[PDB]
Design a protein around this nucleic acid. Structure first.
Ligand code: MG
Ligand code: MG
Ligand code: MG
Ligand code: MG
Ligand code: MG
Ligand code: MG
Ligand code: MG
Ligand code: MG
Ligand code: MG
Ligand code: MG
Ligand code: MG
Ligand code: MG
Lengths: 156, 48, 50, 98, 177
RNA sequence: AAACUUUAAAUAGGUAGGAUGGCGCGGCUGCUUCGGUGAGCCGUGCCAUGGAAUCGGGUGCUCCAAGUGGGCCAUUUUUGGUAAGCAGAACUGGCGAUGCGGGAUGAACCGGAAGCCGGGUUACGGUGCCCAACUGCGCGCUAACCUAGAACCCACAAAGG
RNA sequence: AUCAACUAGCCCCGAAAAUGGAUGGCGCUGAAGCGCGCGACCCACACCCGGCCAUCUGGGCGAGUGCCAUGCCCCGAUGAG
């Protein structure tokens, strides 16, 4: 309304990708959701029911209520000077589970394992990542060194 | 002040020779210049 | 005298000068709107805890 | 303080020793880059991009001619790359720091 | 004393990657005003020639080169690539100076004067000593003669230090060459 | 090819980076399943070196209420227009509400935002006189018998000889 | 010894408006123009130290020799409208 209906400006947002038109692979239906997982809303052109508004294509949020044929997602929309946790129900064809927390949930166990292994021995460790910092010195075994000089200008 | 043994024998002649040879080798490779047998059009301008 | 005017100029400033207020994340997240078939069960169990 | 002076001196001499050693062995030694930066702000607080304002509030450079000590890590150096026209920074040496 | 340029040689290579665990090595001879500017020029030429960027590169060595005999005059040639207002061109320049380091200064000054080309627009393709009896430019060639003699057509009258200089002086100065 | 696209950037967008986490035990369900099967909750016991960098008290919660709702300029993206010191948008900053140093003079161009003083040093911009600072040290080109030329915006010059 | 083309710096031709007239003015010509530099130097209410005012923050002061306690003392930052 007010100049723009539900599916405006989506000449390309809602299209299928090239040579991925037609059928829905069964995996998008047999991936199962539980309340709390982080899922990515990406609308699917061909399934017209339960569709989310074009704003929500390409966001992530936590499932908050799961029903038959429908997932309840709870994502942040920024309006004014505040963040509203909007709650939408999207049909399962429009959501894919996210791999944002893949590394997190792997690393959680990878950490608790080393805190256990440290409790084994001298019970001091530090299970933190550090961003790539200064690289230490080393010798370079002198090889053939290629001299490069700026090229004279051939107009052609 | 009165010319005491101020810095005397510190290293021998074979060592002070190989050090000088390694320095001069690095100098040769440090001032080494390019072949310029690549640019078949600016040969005569570059002189080679 | 063109009574139709529109900008978003200065609106990001007004938004952000007092922060973009995120809501306080909550222990015991709200259930209103959830699946009534799920919530009736959830209530009834808590009725018959011991 | 005694053994700090001792180890400073040892590190400074050791770098020279490895550089000559690598040269005589034929190749060359590559110094292990600076772990620390001194960053001093060189522009006034007027007409700044708001991202730049926040970056400088985190780097703690909130007034012209402030100078702060910073670890070199990828997060920090790519945070400096954003406010680079506003800062002058480099690798302080022992006299500078003391 | 102080020289506005210094001929460094910078040696660098791309970062280690799983294939090609010893990436190949590049050497260059760059003029600049100091280390950091020579380095920043080196990454320029290995990012427009050899497809390597500072992020995805690593610098191993930088030496400052000096001159062999600062006491003798050496006919220098510089082959240089420059940007005019409407294109690029290629120049050859012959100088007489005691050092290549001074010749480069003289050459930036000549390109800033004869052509209003600034430093950010000039590249020194090849530098070399083009010894006498093989020089090409007339202004170089005309100083290749012993038994040379010329008087000084231009000689500033000027007190030896700023102290000895006053505003009124009784006698019109005697200038003679 | 603005109302064409296989491909497809950069900047900008979203989410996660633990104490609001997990595992054991024994319980509820009127949901779920062929079914202790799951889903969730409930009680209890254990763990969990604080889970990238940096920074730092917070709108965290609420009440009452003011003024405002004529905008304008700039760098960049951009629609109409031949264009406009024009009309309409996008991101940010400025003026409006703001002095001060520079651009001779200027609301928004450059520097920079301030209690009242003493001392030092600078930014922008300059050092021939007006006018505080060099008729400084160097190297080139210009000789204008048209008002040669001489500051980011900025007070233009074109095709062409 | 030289011939031709191309190219690009400054200058010139291209280049015309009405009050007298504006590189800000005078003037400037191994510049006081143009391009690049080097040593210093001059200049803001900007940065630093120091004194003072105020606001804010944080402290001290009772078997009281005890105080406009609504006070005094100390520390720190800040100051456009
Ligand atoms: Mg609307
Ligand atoms: Mg309506
Ligand atoms: Mg309406
Ligand atoms: Mg698409
Ligand atoms: Mg329908
Ligand atoms: Mg209006
Ligand atoms: Mg394509
Ligand atoms: Mg956008
Ligand atoms: Mg992202
Ligand atoms: Mg003063
Ligand atoms: Mg004066
Ligand atoms: Mg108070």
């Amino acid at each position: 309304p007010a100049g723009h209906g539900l599916r405006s400006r989506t000449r390309d947002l809602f299209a299928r990708p090239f040579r991925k038109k037609g059928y829905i692979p069964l995996t998008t239906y047999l991936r199962t959701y539980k309340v709390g997982e982080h899922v990515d809303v990406k609308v699917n052109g061909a399934v017209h029911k339960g569709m989310p508004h074009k704003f929500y294509h390409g966001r992530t949020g936590r499932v908050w209520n799961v029903t038959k044929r429908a997932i309840g997602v709870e994502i942040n929309k920024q309006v004014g000077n505040r963040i509203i946790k909007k709650r939408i129900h999207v049909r399962v064809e429009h959501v894919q589970p996210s791999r944002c927390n893949e590394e997190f949930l792997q690393r959680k166990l990878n950490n608790d394992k080393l805190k256990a292994e440290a409790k084994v021995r001298g019970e001091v460790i530090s299970t933190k990542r550090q961003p790539a910092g200064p690289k230490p010195g080393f010798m370079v075994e002198g090889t053939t060194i290629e001299t490069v000089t700026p090229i004279p200008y051939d107009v052609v | 002040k009165e010319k005491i043994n101020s810095k005397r024998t510190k290293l021998s002649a074979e060592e002070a020779s190989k050090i000088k040879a390694a320095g001069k080798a690095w100098y040769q490779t440090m001032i080494s210049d390019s072949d310029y047998t690549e640019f078949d059009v600016f040969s005569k301008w570059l002189g080679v | 005298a063109k009574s139709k005017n529109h900008t978003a100029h200065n609106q990001s400033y007004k938004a952000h000068r007092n922060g973009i207020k995120k809501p306080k994340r909550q222990r015991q997240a709200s259930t209103k709107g959830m699946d009534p078939k799920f919530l009736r069960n959830l209530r009834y169990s808590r009725k018959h805890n011991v | 303080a005694e053994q700090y002076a001792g180890e400073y001196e040892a590190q400074d001499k050791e770098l020279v020793q490895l550089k000559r050693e690598a040269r005589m062995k034929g190749g060359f030694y590559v110094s292990p880059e600076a772990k620390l930066l001194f960053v001093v702000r060189i522009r006034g607080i007027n007409a700044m991009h708001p991202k730049t304002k926040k970056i400088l509030q985190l780097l703690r450079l909130r007034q012209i001619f402030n100078g702060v000590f910073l670890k070199v890590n990828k997060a920090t150096i790519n945070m400096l790359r954003r406010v680079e026209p506003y800062v002058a920074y480099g690798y302080p040496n022992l006299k500078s720091v003391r | 004393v102080a020289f506005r340029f210094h001929q460094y040689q910078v040696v660098g290579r791309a970062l280690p990657t799983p294939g090609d665990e010893q990436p190949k090595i590049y050497r260059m001879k760059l003029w600049a005003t100091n280390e950091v500017r020579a380095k920043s020029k080196f990454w320029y030429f290995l990012r427009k020639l050899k497809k390597v960027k500072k992020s995805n590169g690593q610098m191993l060595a930088i030496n400052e080169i000096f001159e062999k005999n600062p006491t003798t005059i050496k006919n220098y040639g510089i082959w240089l690539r420059y940007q005019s207002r409407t294109g690029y061109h290629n120049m050859y320049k012959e100088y007489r100076d005691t050092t290549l380091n001074g010749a480069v200064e003289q050459m930036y000054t000549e390109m800033a004067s004869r052509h209003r080309v600034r430093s950010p627009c000039i590249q020194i393709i090849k530098t070399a000593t083009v010894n006498f009896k093989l020089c090409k430019r007339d202004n170089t060639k005309q100083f290749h003669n012993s038994k040379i003699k010329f008087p000084l057509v231009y000689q500033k009258v000027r007190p030896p230090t700023r102290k000895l200089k006053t505003t009124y002086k009784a006698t019109r100065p005697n200038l003679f060459m």
